[PDB]
């Protein structure tokens, strides 16, 4: 009944998802937006919402009375979900309709309102009918169809029937009738060819039941209509198979040159709409009634007609000349129009205005930037559009249409908000006027030659920088002349050996001065000395390697919480790390949010006051989810939440500068959504985890009594003996602590395998973490903190095969069995020479130990009789071809079975 992350906004919708008209008087209209379905009232200026699906919403149809709305989603696990318009918080559902079926790719509901009928996405498609007025949760009747008909993606119900449906693909059309007393659904899908008319007919789009005659209509891209008649069992057939009603292609006629694709029929008119901005109404004779045409309007994909049957004024009225021999009054319902290019309009029934509504991004979507002091947010498409909203007002305001065919993706404000900037996929960069979106530079800057991938301003307005997908950096600077500021190019440099993952500006308050910082996938981090940089010479002076076995993804300033200062970075290991504002060395190991995928990007909520200085919050997105974190991080699951959005992928972040709201832009969903947050709900969730070790104990299997936990605790004592030495004549003594050299031993002893580099990292972490407060190195570590280190450093589950497989797959040939495999001497030599080096005698000792040729423990009694045996054992123990299967049989008696999650918050 309350949530941390609630949704209520939609910007944009996919124009291929057909609109309907519901409540007329107030103007409230229905559109689908990714996995969500939405109602919006123009005059109240408020949205109403239908709450999600397991996948993107695939298809919908509204009852004729606009009381009922039905919807489906694509992908697995699909649900068919039906709704009452005027409760506005309704429910109805069909569970589990199809196991494999990838959601229902077309679906109609009876105007009769008794039945629902559906077409599944599947390699062979399903047809099923559903008595939705009953709480039925299984198909009443079923058929599956040859592939030859193709994707079937239009379906309609017959207003003159209860047991007839039509469907077509691009390339086949189908008639259906359901014999419920027989329990049989029958189909026919006859094949058209040129022979029927010796004429071109080509591809066709939609099919519909005629107004009054035993007929089925099909509309063509060819400018033509096709019509069929149905034939029903002749009486002599009734004694036999009574071959279910057959469809015959009586007639073809050409109605216009231009492509038609829309067809719907209203109150004994037919209505047809075109690729190029002409919409026509007809009487069942196919007689011509006055059309609507040539507005700034095209490829009309959404037609819909009002619930209101028109009352009839005639004393003063505006009606058009019908084209009858006389030409009479003509009064449609009100009706809705919308284009291909996502342009939404309502018509006054009397024609006196063609009124347009919201207008929205055509195609694919990329993430939005907020003004830092004003309730303004800027949205941009790939195509031709950047536009700004006041997200409190929900009002569409200033926008500029951009030059044709340039792709655009990156957007930024400068820290003042006075400037806006955008990045264009064809080698192109603009600076923009945070008012008029004038091209500030008389020409844009077009120095690079492929897609941007980041842009950012310095704290100084005078400097801006971008990344490009060629892994090349570029920087931008202001020059002061004549009392003017002008913007000017600054010089490119290639500094990353893999895809760039973040780009950042930095301040030297130490000198009130600007800094430039870049995150690559190459595990390398760099800073550039702007103040020494010069033309054709970005001054590169600092490279760090910052990840291992993995790669980083995001870079931001950590907020000030400390004397020290940090950058925050995240990696494919689900790890987060802090690096030092001077040395960029590491000391923090964190476990990222468990939620399904690694973090893609994070942004930090703004500060008003000391009250925020007392309480800081971090926002992040992953592949498919958006989530919140309270600082400091410690990997506690209760400390974090994440929620699912546009679940074919999310691609950027933006935050309301008041600190109330966040906005997510998807991609192919063409949709942007606002999110409204309760922090106290997360404080409550934190309280669910309790305090002290309780969360971390909960992370250990069996917590404080699990046999694992006791097994670990012994190693603390055993390693304490090792630190004392096994041989001593004194009293034994132990207390609270192990000495850091033992810590790698204990960590391995539990079952996690840090590299030498990881060891160095952890020793740095322990030494330095206390350092700045104490002034001191410290080297006695206590169990509770060691446990925290393990829990952060460990693989985010049990140890996994996957990296082993990947390593063999890189190193090995595919063998006779194709298995990725390594030859024994090559394998040995590589293990000595490469990676981290091994001494030959060291490696031989290791193998002899693993095979168990030595005496055990290697820590009290001598051995040297053994080692000569291992020389021959290197041949005799190791097979000539080695594989992950063999190597894991040698290393592992542990069957490292797979983890599970579903209960975890």
């Amino acid at each position: 009944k309350v949530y941390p992350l609630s949704m209520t906004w939609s910007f944009g919708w996919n124009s291929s998802l057909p609109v309907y008209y519901m409540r007329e008087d107030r103007r409230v209209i229905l559109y689908t937006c990714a996995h969500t379905a939405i109602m919006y009232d123009v005059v109240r200026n408020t949205q109403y919402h239908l709450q999600g699906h397991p996948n993107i919403i695939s298809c919908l149809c509204v009852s004729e009375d606009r009381r009922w709305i039905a919807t489906a989603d694509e992908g697995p696990d699909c649900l068919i979900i039906i709704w009452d318009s005027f409760t506005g918080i309704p429910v109805h559902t069909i569970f589990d309709s199809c196991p494999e079926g990838n959601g229902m790719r077309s679906i109609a509901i009876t105007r009769d309102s008794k039945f629902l009928a559906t077409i599944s996405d599947s390699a062979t498609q399903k047809v099923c009918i559903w008595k939705w007025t009953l709480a039925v949760e299984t198909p009443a009747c079923t058929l599956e169809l040859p592939k030859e008909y193709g994707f079937q993606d239009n379906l309609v119900f017959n207003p003159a029937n209860n047991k007839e449906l039509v469907s077509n693909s691009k390339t086949q059309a189908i008639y259906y009738c359901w014999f419920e007393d027989k329990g049989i659904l029958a189909h026919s899908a006859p094949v058209l060819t040129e022979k029927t008319f010796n004429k071109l007919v080509g591809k066709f789009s939609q099919s519909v039941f005629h107004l009054k005659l035993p007929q089925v209509l099909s509309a063509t891209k060819e400018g033509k209509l096709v019509v069929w008649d149905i034939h029903y069992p002749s009486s002599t057939s009734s004694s036999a198979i009574s071959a279910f009603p057959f469809i015959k292609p009586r007639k073809l006629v050409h109605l216009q040159k231009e492509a038609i694709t829309v067809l719907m029929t209203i109150d004994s008119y037919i209505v047809t709409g075109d690729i190029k901005g002409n919409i026509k109404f007809y009487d069942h004779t196919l007689s011509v009634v006055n059309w609507y045409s040539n507005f700034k309007l095209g490829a009309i994909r959404t037609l819909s007609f009002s619930k209101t049957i028109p009352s009839l004024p005639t004393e003063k009225s505006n009606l058009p000349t019908d084209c009858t021999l006389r030409g009479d009054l003509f009064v449609v319902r009100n009706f809705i129009i919308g284009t291909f290019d996502a342009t939404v309009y309502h018509m006054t029934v009397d024609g006196t205005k063609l009124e347009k509504l919201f207008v929205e991004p055509r195609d694919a979507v990329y993430a939005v930037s907020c003004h830092p002091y004003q309730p303004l947010i800027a949205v941009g498409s790939v195509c031709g559009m950047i536009k700004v909203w006041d997200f409190e007002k929900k009002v569409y305001l200033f926008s500029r249409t951009f030059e044709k065919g340039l792709g655009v993706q990156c957007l930024t404000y400068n820290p003042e908000g006075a400037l806006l900037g955008a990045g264009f996929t064809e080698g192109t960069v603009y600076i923009l006027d945070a008012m008029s979106l004038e091209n500030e530079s008389p020409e844009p800057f077009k120095y690079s030659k492929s897609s941007v991938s980041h842009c950012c301003f310095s704290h100084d307005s005078n400097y801006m920088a971008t990344a490009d997908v060629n892994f090349t950096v570029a920087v931008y600077m202001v020059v002061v002349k004549n009392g003017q500021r002008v913007w000017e190019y600054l010089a490119r440099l290639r500094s990353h050996q893999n895809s760039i993952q973040s780009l950042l500006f930095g301040v030297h308050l130490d000198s009130n001065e600007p800094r430039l910082l870049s995150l690559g996938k190459d595990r390398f981090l760099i800073e550039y000395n702007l103040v020494k940089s010069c033309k054709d010479h970005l001054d590169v002076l600092d490279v760090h390697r910052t990840d291992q076995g993995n790669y980083p993804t995001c870079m931001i300033w950590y907020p000030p919480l400390t004397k020290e200062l940090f950058l925050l970075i995240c990696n494919s290991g689900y790890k987060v790390k802090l690096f030092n504002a001077t040395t960029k060395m590491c000391r923090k190991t964190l476990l990222g949010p468990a939620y399904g995928s690694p973090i893609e990007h994070a942004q930090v909520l703004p500060v008003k006051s000391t009250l925020e200085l007392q309480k800081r919050y971090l926002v992040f997105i992953n592949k498919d989810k958006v989530g919140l974190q309270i600082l400091p991080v410690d990997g506690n699951p209760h400390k974090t939440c994440a929620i699912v959005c546009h679940p074919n992928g999310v691609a950027g972040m933006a935050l309301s500068y008041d600190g109330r709201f966040a906005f997510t832009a998807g991609g192919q969903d063409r949709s942007v959504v606002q999110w409204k947050i309760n922090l106290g709900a997360l404080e409550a969730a934190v309280s669910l985890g309790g305090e002290d070790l309780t969360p971390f104990y909960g992370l250990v299997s069996g917590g404080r009594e699990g046999k694992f936990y006791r097994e670990l605790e012994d190693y603390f004592y055993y390693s304490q003996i090792r630190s004392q030495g096994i041989d001593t004549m004194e009293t034994r003594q132990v207390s609270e602590h192990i000495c850091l050299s033992e810590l790698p031993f204990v960590m391995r002893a539990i079952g996690f395998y840090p590299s030498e580099e990881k060891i160095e990292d952890m020793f740095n972490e322990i030494k330095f973490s206390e350092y700045v407060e104490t002034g001191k190195l410290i080297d006695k570590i206590n169990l509770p903190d060691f446990l925290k280190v393990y829990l952060n450093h460990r693989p985010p589950f049990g140890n996994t095969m996957d990296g082993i497989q990947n390593s063999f797959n890189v190193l090995g040939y595919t063998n006779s069995e194709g298995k990725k495999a390594i030859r024994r001497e090559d394998f040995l030599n590589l293990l000595l020479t490469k990676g981290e080096h091994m001494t030959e005698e060291e490696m031989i000792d290791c193998f002899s130990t693993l095979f168990g040729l030595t005496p055990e423990g290697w820590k009290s009694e001598p051995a040297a009789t053994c080692i000569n045996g291992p020389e021959i054992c290197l041949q005799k123990e190791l097979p000539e071809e080695i594989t992950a299967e063999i190597f894991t049989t040698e290393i592992l008696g542990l069957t490292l079975s797979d983890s599970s999650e579903q209960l975890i918050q």
Binding site: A418, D433, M435, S436, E438, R485
Partner: peptide
């Protein structure tokens, strides 16, 4: 006139930057 407003806004914020 809009461009003149942008120019005047620029001049005024530069004058504040001089006051800064």
């Amino acid at each position: 006139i809009i461009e003149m407003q942008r120019l005047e806004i620029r001049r005024l914020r530069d004058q504040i930057q001089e006051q800064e």
